[PDB]
Amino acid sequence: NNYDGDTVTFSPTGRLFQVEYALEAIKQGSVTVGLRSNTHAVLVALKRNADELSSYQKKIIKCDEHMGLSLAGLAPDARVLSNYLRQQCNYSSLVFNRKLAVERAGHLLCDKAQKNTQSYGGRPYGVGLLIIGYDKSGAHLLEFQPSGNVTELYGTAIGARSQGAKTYLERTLDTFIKIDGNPDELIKAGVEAISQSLRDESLTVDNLSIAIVGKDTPFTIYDGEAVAKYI
Amino acid sequence: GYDLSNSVFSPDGRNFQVEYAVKAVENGTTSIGIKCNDGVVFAVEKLITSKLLVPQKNVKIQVVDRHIGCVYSGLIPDGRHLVNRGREEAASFKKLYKTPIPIPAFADRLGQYVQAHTLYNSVRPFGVSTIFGGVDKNGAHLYMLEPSGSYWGYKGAATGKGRQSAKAELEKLVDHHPEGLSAREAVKQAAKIIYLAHEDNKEKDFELEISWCSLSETNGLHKFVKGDLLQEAIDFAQKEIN
Amino acid sequence: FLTRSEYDRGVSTFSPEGRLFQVEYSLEAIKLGSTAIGIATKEGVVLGVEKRATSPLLESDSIEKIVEIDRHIGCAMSGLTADARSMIEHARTAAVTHNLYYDEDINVESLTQSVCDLALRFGEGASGEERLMSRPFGVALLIAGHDADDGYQLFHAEPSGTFYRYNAKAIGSGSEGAQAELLNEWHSSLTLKEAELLVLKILKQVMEEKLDENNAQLSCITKQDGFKIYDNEKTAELIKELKEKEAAE
Amino acid sequence: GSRRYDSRTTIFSPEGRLYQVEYALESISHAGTAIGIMASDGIVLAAERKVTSTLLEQDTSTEKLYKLNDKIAVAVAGLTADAEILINTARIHAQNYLKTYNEDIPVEILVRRLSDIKQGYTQHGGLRPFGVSFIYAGYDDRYGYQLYTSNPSGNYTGWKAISVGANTSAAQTLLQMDYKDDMKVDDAIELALKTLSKTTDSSALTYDRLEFATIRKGANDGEVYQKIFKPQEIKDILVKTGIT
Amino acid sequence: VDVLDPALLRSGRLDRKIEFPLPSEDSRAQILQIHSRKMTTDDDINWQELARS
Amino acid sequence: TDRYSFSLTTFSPSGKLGQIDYALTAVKQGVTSLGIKATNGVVIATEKKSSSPLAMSETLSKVSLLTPDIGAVYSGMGPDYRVLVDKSRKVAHTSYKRIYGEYPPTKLLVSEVAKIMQEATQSGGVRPFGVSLLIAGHDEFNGFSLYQVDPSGSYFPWKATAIGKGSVAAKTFLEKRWNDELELEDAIHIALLTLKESVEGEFNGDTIELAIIGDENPDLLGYTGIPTDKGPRFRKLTSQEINDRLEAL
Amino acid sequence: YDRALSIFSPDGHIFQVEYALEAVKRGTCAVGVKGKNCVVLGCERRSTLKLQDTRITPSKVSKIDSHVVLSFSGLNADSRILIEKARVEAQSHRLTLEDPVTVEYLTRYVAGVQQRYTQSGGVRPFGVSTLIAGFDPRDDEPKLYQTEPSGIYSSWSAQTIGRNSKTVREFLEKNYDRKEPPATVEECVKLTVRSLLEVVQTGAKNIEITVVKPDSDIVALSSEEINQYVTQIEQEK
Amino acid sequence: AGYDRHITIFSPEGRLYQVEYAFKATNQTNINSLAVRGKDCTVVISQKKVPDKLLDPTTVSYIFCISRTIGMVVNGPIPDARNAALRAKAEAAEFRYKYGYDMPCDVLAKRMANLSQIYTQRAYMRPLGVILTFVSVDEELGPSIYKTDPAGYYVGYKATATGPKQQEITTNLENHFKKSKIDHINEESWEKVVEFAITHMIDALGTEFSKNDLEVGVATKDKFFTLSAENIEERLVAIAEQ
DSSP: OOSSSOTTOOOSSSSOHHHHHHTHHHHSSOOEEEEEOSSEEEEEEEOEESSSSBOEEOOEEEEETTEEEEOOBOHHHHHHHHHHHHHHHHHHHHHSOOOOOHHHHHHHHHHHHHHHHHSTTOOOOOBOOEEEEEETTEEEEEEEOSSOOEEEBSEEEESTTOHHHHHHHHHTHHHHTTOOSOHHHHHHHHHHHTTTTOSSOOOOTTTEEEEEEESSSOOEEEOSSSGGGTO | OTTSOSSOOOTTSOOHHHHHHHHHHTTSOOEEEEEOSSEEEEEEEEEEOOTTBOSSOOOSEEEETTTEEEEEEEOHHHHHHHHHHHHHHHHHHHHHHSSOOOHHHHHHHHHHHHHGGGSOTTOOOOOEEEEEEEEETTEEEEEEEOTTSOEEEBSEEEESTTHHHHHHHHHHHHHHOSSOOOTTTTHHHHHHHHHHTTSSSTTSEEEEEEEEEEHHHHSSOOEEOOHHHHHHHHHHHHHHHO | OOOOOSOOSSSSOOOSSSSOSHHHHHTTSSSSSOOEEEEEOSSOEEEEEOOOOOOSSSOSSSOOSEEESSSSEEEEEEEOHHHHHHHHHHHHHHHHHHHHHTOSOOOHHHHHHHHHHHHSOOSSSOSSSOOOOSSOOOEEEEEEEEETTTEEEEEEEOSSSOEEEESEEEESTTHHHHHHHHHHHOOSSOOHHHHHHHHHHHHHHTOSSOOSTTSOEEEEEETTTEEEEOOHHHHHHHHHHHHHHSSOO | OHHHHOOOOSSOOTTSOOHHHHHHHHHGGGSOOEEEEEOSSEEEEEEEOSOOOSSBOOSSOOSSEEEEETTEEEEEEEOHHHHHHHHHHHHHHHHHHHHHHSSOOOHHHHHHHHHHHHHHHHHBSSOOOOOEEEEEEEEETTTEEEEEEEOTTSOEEEBSEEEESTTHHHHHHHHHHHOOSSOOHHHHHHHHHHHHHHHOSSSOOOGGGEEEEEEEEEETTTEEEEEEOOHHHHHHHHHHTTOO | OOSOOGGGSSTTTSOOOOOOOOOOHHHHHHHHHHHHTTSOOOSOOOHHHHHHO | OOOTTSOSOOBOTTSSBHHHHHHHHGGGGSOOEEEEEOSSOEEEEEEOOOSSTTSOSSSOOSEEEEETTEEEEEEEOHHHHHHHHHHHHHHHHHTTSSSSSSOOOHHHHHHHHHHHHHTTTSSSSOOOOOEEEEEEEEETTTEEEEEEEOTTSOEEEBSEEEESTTHHHHHHHHHHHOOSSOOHHHHHHHHHHHHHHHOOSOOSTTTEEEEEEOSOOGGGSSOOSOOSSOOOSEEEEOHHHHHHHHTTO | OOOOSOOEETTTEEHHHHHHHHHHHSSOOEEEEEOSSOEEEEEEOOOOSSSBOOSSSOOSEEEEETTEEEEEEEOHHHHHHHHHHHHHHHHHHHHHTOSOOOHHHHHHHHHHHHHHHHHSSSBOOOOEEEEEEEEOTTOOOEEEEEEETTTEEEEOSEEEESTTHHHHHHHHHHHSOSSOOOSSHHHHHHHHHHHHTTTSOSSSSSEEEEEEETTTEEEEEOHHHHHHHHHHHHHHO | OOOSSSSSOOOTTSOOHHHHHHTTSSOSSOOOEEEEEOSSOEEEEEEOOOSSTTBOTTTOOSEEEOSSSOEEEEESOHHHHHHHHHHHHHHHHHHHHHHSSOOOHHHHHHHHHHHHHHHTTSTTOOOOOOEEEEEEEOSSSOEEEEEEOTTSOEEEOSEEEESTTHHHHHHHHHHHHHHHOSSSOOOSSTHHHHHHHHHHHHHHHSOOOOTTSEEEEEEOSSOEEEEOHHHHHHHHHHHHTO
C-alpha cells in the first residue's frame, strides 16, 4: 500500500492500481467467447459447477427478446448491472416505443461505473460483460471492461486464457463473417473457439451454454439436450 | 501524505494530485485542434488494437449541442462523464435563454465542473484534456481545457502523446499562414500532423477520424468529414511520410 | 489473529486477489457454524441440525435452528445466527408479498435469489439500492423447498450473493468431513427413510456429544404434508433403529 | 479522504471500555470541588471556585451554581461550555413537563432525562462526551429532599453525602466520619465549610472563593426557599464557624 | 530500472537504454527449439503447436 | 460526499482538550487589547495594525458595535473575529428584538455567543475560533458590566482585564492601578498609559482605537422630539478626541 | 455520519462483539433460577460504598410490564436505552394486537434491538446482557430467557451472567436439578441466596432478591427479609 | 496525530499552517500588479505574458469584470481565479435584487472575505490561493482599493501592489507618497494616472514594456472599462515626452 488501497487517489505513474486490480476480475474469470457474423450473434459461455452434487450456475442472462449479457467475474456485481440494463431497455419500449440501441446502452453502463470511481466509498465493478443483440442495424457484440471501455468487435473473449481464444479468432476471422443465413455453423465455430481455451475441463451437455439472436429468431438460451446437437 | 490528495496543500505551491492528472492525459493518443478562419477542425488518432475490431464504429469526437465539437484524451471512460455533464449544461442554457450556447459560455461551465473536483476529500480531479470549439454568432472560438481547470484561447492547441511532434508543426503552420488558412485546406493539414504524431506511437496501427465545424462548409454545425473527402486527406499525408 | 492482510481498510477495496477480502471472511464464519446437514432426494428433503447443548442447565429442546419461511419452503441457519434473525423475517415477508401480488406459491429459486439481493447491500452508499448495511452478513442458509413446477429443490445461499443448487450439502464446522461421505453415499435412486437415516449417519460423525434427541432435530418438506418439524419422540425412534442395524455388523 | 482521517473514538477498547469517558473523568479533578451534604431539614451545596484573582469580578458570578427550576438547582464542575448547553436543555425539559401535566417535575425524572442525553453522545455519532458532573439538590413531596450525582457516561446514583471534582477520594473519607443521619442546616453548613477547608487546593479558603447555596424548610407552609446567598452573607457564616 | 539514481537517468553514463521485452509469438517458438536441440526428441514435433499454447 | 460530522475535538489522554489548548496560545500571538471598568462608564482600547504602512486603518475595525450599548473588542485572529461579530448581531436581533422587541442585556448577549463557540468545540468540520473577546456593555438593571468570553466557551465577568500577547505584564500593571472608584475621565488616562507600556508604535489617535460605553448621548439619537428613549451609550472615539488626551498623560 | 464503528474481522467475528462480551464480564452478577410456579432473579448490588441513598435509586431489576422483569449486567449507563425501548413495545402490543406481551415476543424484540446496533453503520453494539423472565398471561409456566449482546437469544432452565458467573454455574449444575426445581417458593429463594453467597460474600446487605408469581405480582423483598433467609442458610451450613 | 495540517487545525504554536500554504501559492502566475488612486479615478496595471506564440493574446487576462463598477485583478493560479470571479458575480446579482442598488465594493470585500473564513473553518474545503485586488470608484467613500487575501483578512489601501517581486513596488509607492505627503495623486483625469503608474513599474521591475506585454484596467466614475493594446500604445509614447 502506497497508493494502492484507495479508489479516489493518484498515483505518480498516472494509472491507478484499483482499476488494474478490477481487471484481475477478468483474469480469474471463466472463459466466455462471443462472435458475430452479420445475421446472427452467438455467445458461448463456459459454465462452472462447484462440485458433482452441485449444478452449474448459469453465466447468460436474458436481458430481452433481442438482447443478452454474460458475465465474467463476480456474481453479485453482475446481478446489479443486469437489472439496470433491463430497466433502461423497458424504458425505451414504454417511452419511445422502441428496441433499445445497443451502441447507446454501452455508454449508460460506462457512466454507472464512472460514478463509483469518482466518489469515495464506491467501488469499481468486478464484472466484464459481453452483450450481444440484433437491432435495426444488424448484429452487434459489445465488450464491457471494468474501466468502462465499450468497444464493438467482430468477435472477442474475456476470461482466463482469453489469449488463446483471441489468437483462434484472428485465424478464423474471415470465415465467420462470410457465413450468414446458417446459424448452425457460427455455433460450431464457437464450440471450437472455446475448446482452445480449456485446461482439460471438457465440454459436457450441461457445462457448455450457447445463446443466439438472429434476423428472425429471438434471444434464446440453449442448455439440456439442445446443446448436444452442437456438441 | 501531503503528496497524496487534492484538498492538501504543501509549501511548494504544489498540490501533487492535480499534476498527476496530467500524467494520465500523457498516456492518451494525439488530438489536435487547428483553428482556421472559418471554424475549427479536430482530428484524433484512433489506435487499431486488433484486426478483430469492427472499423470506423467508435467515435472519440462527441458532439455537445449541435455546434460545439468536443474531443478529449486521457482516460476514455472518465472523459465520457465530462462530456455528458457539458451536454446537460448546454441543454439547461438552451432552455433558459432560447439560443444555442456561446463558446465562451460553454467554457465557463465545463471549467467550473473540473475545478470542483480539487476542493473535496471525497472526489478525484478528472484526468482528461478536452479540446472544444465550433461556430457561434460572435464567431469561431477554440479552447483547450487542462485537468487542472486551466484554459486559454488558442490558435492551435494539442494534447496527447504526440503533442511533441504536433506543437512544432503548428508553429510551422502559423508561420506558413500567419493570415490564416481555409477550413477546406486545413482538412489536409490535420491528416498531415496526426500521421507525423504516430512516429511517437509506432508500435501499432491507427485510423484517422476528422470532423469539422466551419461556417462556410457545414452551415455552422459539428459534422464528420466522411466518404471520398476523408480518403483524399489520408492519401495526401500518406505520400508525404513516404 | 494478526495474519497478514494488506488491504481491508475499505469495506470494499481491492486487493491484488481480484476479489474482495471482506466477502471471503464472511465464508470463514460458516466453518464455526454448528453443523447443518441436508440431503435432497426426489421424494423429499430432510433438514437436520444439531441443536447444540452448551450446558446441562441449558434447555436444548427449546432452542432450534429449524426456521419456517412458509409452509412450502423451509430453511436452516448455520453461522452467526444473529444475522439470520434479520434476514429470515425478510424472507417470510417476501413470500407473503408474492402471495399477495400473484396468489401463488413462490419458486424456491426465486426466494433464494431474493435473500441474495439482500445479502449484497453492504457499503457506504453506492449503486441502485441504498446501502443500509455496512458490514456483510456472516451467515449461510440452506433453503429447501417443494414447488409443483420444478419439484424438490435445495439451495445453498451464501453471504456472497450466490446460490448454487445442490443435491445435498452439509455446512458448518464438520463440513469437510461431511462432504467426503456425501460424494460416495448420495445417489438419485434413494428413498425417503434411507435418506432420513443418512442424515443421522452423517450427523453421527460430526456429533460432539453423542446422538440422542436432546441435541439433534430433524425436519422435512414433503409435497402433500408441507413443512413439518419432527418432534423428539418421533426422532428417537429412527435413531434407535439406526442403532439396531449398526449392530447387525 | 474522509474515512481515512476518521478518529473512530466511540469504539470499545479491548477492555470493553470507553477511553474518552475516562479521559473526561480524569479532567474534572482539574476543575474545582463541589460538594453536597444532605441534612434532614435541607440541602447544602458548597462549591469551591476553580478561578480566583483580585482583578476577577466574582460577585455576579454564579459560575458553578444554576437554577434549573425554583426547586431543583445544580452544582456544575467541569468544562463550562458543554455544561451551559445542558442547563438550557434542562430548563426546556422542566417547563415541558409543566406544560403537559401542570405539575412540577419530581427530582427522579429530570435526573434520568439529562443522563439519557449524555448517554447518546458516548453511544454513537462519533462525538466526544459532554464532560460535566452535576450535584442536584432538589425537593419534591413524593420522596422529600433528594441528592444526586451524574457523570459523563450518563449514570446516576443517589447519595447522602457526596463530593465531585478535585480530591474525590479525600472528601469522601472525611464525610463518612463527620456525618450523622439527621442534622440541622447550620451544622451542615459548618460541615460543608470544614471539608472544603481540609481539601482546598490553595491553603486559604475564603468567602469570595466560595459559592454557597441552600434549600431550606425555613419557608413556612411546607414550601422550600431556594436561596443563593450574596457573598457578604457567606462572609458572616464563615466567621461564625471560625474558619476565618 | 525504477530503482536507479537520477544521476544515471542522464546521458554520459549509460546513454543508450535497451528494454528486454516479454516474448513474442515467433520468439517463443524459437526459444523452445534451442533447448530441445540439446536432448533427443521424436520427429512428430511441431514447434508452432507448443508456442500457440 | 462528505463524512466530517465526527468530532475533531476530542479529550486528550492526559486530559484537557488539545484543540482548545492550541487556540489559546494563538490569542497571545496577537494584538493587545485591555478594558477597564469604571464606576460611570467602561473603556476598551486596542492597537490598529496592517501589513504595510500604506494600507488604511479607518476601513478596519477592531472595536465593533453589537448594539447601541454594547461594543466588543478582540485579541486573536482578524478573519475569525469578523465572522463572529456578524453572528453575534444576527442572534441578538432574531432572539431578543423580535421576541422582546428591544436589545439584550450584556449577560444575556454573552451567553448567546458562548453557544456559538461551543458548537465549534463540539461536532465535525469546525475547529475553535481563535479569539478572545471582551464584551463590555451597559444594561439598566445591573449597570456597567465587563465580560470576557474565551476560546473554550465559558464566560467570566471581570473588574478589569486584558487579552493578547502583552497580557501577563498588563494585568500586573492594572492591579496596582485599579481603584475602588475610578471615574471615566481618569480611566481613559489609565488605559492609554497601560497600552503605552505595551505598544512601541507611534502613539496617536489614528493607531490607538478608543471606545467607551460611557454615558448616553442624545445627539447620536438620529431623531429628536422623542424624549422617552435616549441615544447610544456606546460612542466610538475618532482620532481628534484621543489627541487631546495624548498630551494630558 | 454513516461511517462504520463495525469493521469486519478475518477471524470470523466482529471485534466489537468480542469487546462487548468482556464488558459484560466485568459487570455485576445476576442469577436466574425458575421454580415450578415462580421465577427468582437474584442480583448483586455493590453497596460496599457508604452513605449511599438506596431508597430513591432504582434496583438492578426493572419491571418492563406487569409480569415481565428484566435484570442486566454490563454497562449500567447503556442499559437504560434498552429499558426505554422495551417498555414502549409492551404498550404497542396492547394497542394494535390487544392482550399483554408474551415473554417470548418481548425477548425476541430485545434480541432484534441489540442486534440492530451491531449491523447498522454509525453505531457500536451495546455491551449489555439481559435476563428476561416472567409469565405469559392466561398461563402459569415460568419462562426464563437470556439475551446477550451478540443479539442471540436463548431459553434457559437456570442461567447466570456477570462477574465470575462460571463459579456460580458449576454450583447450579450440582444443586439445582434439570428435572426437579424446588417446589416451594421459599426454598427456591434460599437456593438462590445460597448460590449468591459464593462470590458476593461480605455480609447480607449486597444481596437483593425480586420474586415474581403469576397473575401479575412483582414484589421485591427488602433487606430485613433477606437477613432472615441468609441467617438460616448460615446456621444450616 | 500525524494529521495536523491536512485539516484546518491549530498547531502547538497556535497557528494555521494550512492557510499559510495558500499564501505560498499566490505566486505561480508570477504576475505583478500595482494599483494607484487618482483624484477622481482608480488605475490598475498588471503584466501580461504568453508562453507561446500559439495562444490567442486577447483571452489571456487576469483583470475580470465583476460589476460594471467593480473590477477585480487576480494574483495566483487561474483555476481558483475563475472560481473567485464566479462567486463574486453571484453576489453582485444578489445585492441589486434585494437592496435595490448596485453592490458597493466595500460590501464585496466583506462578503467574499467571510466566505474565505468559511473555507478555512470546514475541514474539507481548500481555500482559494488568489489574492484579489478590488478596484472601484464609490461616491460614498470615494476611490478605494480593497485587498482581500486567502485568509479572509483585509484592509484598505492608498495604493498597493501584489506579486512576487511586489517588494520592489512597495519602495516606489512609499517614496512617492512621502514626497506628495497625501494619499492620492492630485490629478483630475484618468490619462495621466495611467502615465504615472507605468513609470513606477518601469523603475521597479527594471524592464520597459510594450503594448502586447501590458494589461490595463481603469475604473472611472460609474463605469469600469479595460483599455485595448492600441490605447495602451498611446500612453507609452507620452511618458517619453514628459
